[PDB]
Amino acid sequence: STGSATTTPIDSLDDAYITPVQIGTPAQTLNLDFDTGSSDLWVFSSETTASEVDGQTIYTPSKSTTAKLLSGATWSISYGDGSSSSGDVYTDTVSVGGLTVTGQAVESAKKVSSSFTEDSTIDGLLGLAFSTLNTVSPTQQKTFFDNAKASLDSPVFTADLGYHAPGTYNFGFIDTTAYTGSITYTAVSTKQGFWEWTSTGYAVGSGTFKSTSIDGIADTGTTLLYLPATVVSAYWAQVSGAKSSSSVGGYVFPCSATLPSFTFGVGSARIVIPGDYIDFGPISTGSSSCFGGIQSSAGIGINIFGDVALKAAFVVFNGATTPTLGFASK
Template sequence: MKASLAAILLAALAEGAVTGAWNSSTQESQGSQLSESGGKEFTLTQVKNEGFTGRDGPMAFMRAHMKYTQKLPDFVLEAVNSSSELGMKYAAFSQVGKQMGSVAAHPTHGADSEYAVMVQIGSPPQSIPMNLDTGSADFWVLSTDTDQKMLKGQALYRPASSSSSRRLVGEKWNIKYGDGSSASGILYLDTVQIGGTRVLKMGIESPYTVSNDIANDKFVSGILGLANSAANTVRPVPQGTYLDHIQGQLAQPILTANLRRGAPGNYNFGFINRGEYTGNIQYTPVDQHHPLWKISASGYRIGSKQSQLKIDAIVDTGTSLALLPQRVVDELYSQIQGSFRHPKLGMMVFPCKSKLPDFFLSIGPYNGRLPGEYINYAPIDHENCYGGIQTSAGLPFSVLGDVFLKAQFVVFDYGHQTVGFANKKL
């Protein structure tokens, strides 16, 4: 996962934040324990937003595309131009970064996007709900530096209240988005604690102002990026990710994701829990010329029909939808009675009562199963629903977002630079 010029624009546009207040009494992580080797192992469990209100399919689709490319597909732009409601959403989204120091994480609203992880920042510790994102490498958080008139009561990082906080003068961060806009801010070093591990001088990116889209999110306050640090946007000295800093503390330099549909999932650091998956884990190497978790799948199967089409894809916990090649999307929805591309949304939709086929992603001999019901992302109205698999047309790769990952047990192996997949009980 080495640096590439195209990859620098990828940081921090993470899906998953939502509205509502977080419940500070929720258990967010188990205390770390020592393995036989003496390294630490711990579990970080997602916390639920009790005030969550629902998913926004079109925003999830636009955000997923604009996280990785310079413009939306032509057919989506046509839908934007023909729909005043969609046009307003696009305008609010695409204006992000045109204010000085604005930042966007663009979380997707929805029943499966109502979770965050709790992170302790500063001395004494301040509890901050954040999104864990394997699709970016920046650690940014709303703070007392952020324009308070724009905020809605989110939990804030307060550097002045931390005895260990120190601003690094001259260090700045600048995230370039696919639409050409940017986000920038200042940098602190402070203590960060997660699950019994601690980093004394973690780089914390603090924005001055935020877009309305972010300001209206009352739950999540920042992004915990865990891609390769080559994608970090701090300059002149890029900052390491939290996992970069704690690898030496862990029993093994690995992170596993066991996300769930309609329920809190969990991340394990330093170990693999055999009880969280079935069968064997199939590993595949990461593209060493890319800073994100980019892999190559050897094919796919829809129902009983197998294809050997190679699919290069980013494994991204920070994106809600799965974006796949147009050929795959066409084949999938041809098997769903009544499906069609919505002219005012640019998305594939179908009658909510439709029977949906299972989808399998192939990695060598392994077939990772996505049950048909998981493809139903959210209702549009009483009749039709958004598809959780949409086209990756216009992107340089496919994206395996949460729709797919919630059906899989996933291992991010930093030591061997591989990603592992296994099926699990759903």
């Protein structure tokens, strides 16, 4: 089997992407944030504290003839941005782009932090990291990908995120029309539960490539590109007037600037992030100071190849017995 679903930016800045997911019988369609940096599929629901729901679409398990409470199961999760959610668990039928999993753990939010409440466009998350990170207790649950894997024509999914435009998540096949040149595959460590790999270096604009190993995770659920402070300093030093602002929380730059591209290495291959991808607009409405799309990972504890980087590529998440990551230009 295969699946193919369109993923759509939630706003003009590509702060995140939502992908429609059918849950239950009859289908309830929720728009979820596909997140290769986590492993819980959780949804706003009929169980979510009412004051914590503000415009999201909710999953109502009582209206699904295939929903079954997973007795005793709870979940609780915190993300790198400090947001969190928690609740209980049903199993139900979940389909993505024509691909169907029966008995998928659907984690029903009883509580969500303000960040989620304040974002009316995201009805939940669908984790695509490794199931070892799944927070369901006392019985850890599998991701949608993990549950689908055996049925898929090939044990892969791909992320083709658009820049200010819709893109595509495919399950079980590689769309050879979706990228240019070849796909360069690179080794993955699953030791921390993530799609963790090692970039072979970087360049800033038309500058020479710096060969250097950068360990990081391929994380569709993170907006920006988080890299070591040395790298990020090298990048912003090429932008007149750019500075790190503690008050704002990262590198800002004059909105009047033209940003240079950023290249990262995948083995011998190179992915170029156009400068425009790195502009996340005014720090506040009307401000002439703009927020940078490349930020320091210092104090995160890990480098994150978030959407800024991934949207510049066609990315293959290869869940073979030995998982690997593939990157192609597009």
